């Protein structure tokens, strides 16, 4: 019984995506996770359930309403091109090197201590 109504629909030919504001009605239950929102927007808009990228869902005080943002892309190449990396990591197609800032800064300073070919050697 979880319905979805759209709001502020506007499409971009220059971003190859359609931005809209999602209003989710889920009375009597908890906040619904984003993946059923992705399949329901895939069902209503007749699109594959992998180019829809939703975020920013805040539940109103009282329970029953949830307002959030969501985009519908044309294809996977456009979804890979102009997006932030963390949404792609949430959907599981991007991963970053597991190093902290302190190790990188210390390695940069230690590499700055020497010159030449040994700059790559001291950085391990």
């Amino acid at each position: 019984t979880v319905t979805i109504r759209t709001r502020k629909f506007m499409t971009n030919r220059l971003l190859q995506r359609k931005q809209m504001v999602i209003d989710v009605l889920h009375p009597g239950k908890a906040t619904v996770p984003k993946t059923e929102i992705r399949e329901k927007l895939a069902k209503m808009y007749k699109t594959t359930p992998d180019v829809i990228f939703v975020f920013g869902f805040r539940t109103h005080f009282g329970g029953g309403k949830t307002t959030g943002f969501g985009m519908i892309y044309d294809s996977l190449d456009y979804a890979k091109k102009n997006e932030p990396k963390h949404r792609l990591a949430r959907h599981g197609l991007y991963e970053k090197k597991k190093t902290s800032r302190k190790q990188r800064k210390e390695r940069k300073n230690r590499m700055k201590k020497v010159r030449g070919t040994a700059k790559a050697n001291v950085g391990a």
Partner: peptide, 18 residues
Amino acid sequence: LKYALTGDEVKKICMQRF
């Protein structure tokens, strides 16, 4: 115009020569 949301997206608009 509300085409972009953040400062990176408007840069990606402008670098596509539109």
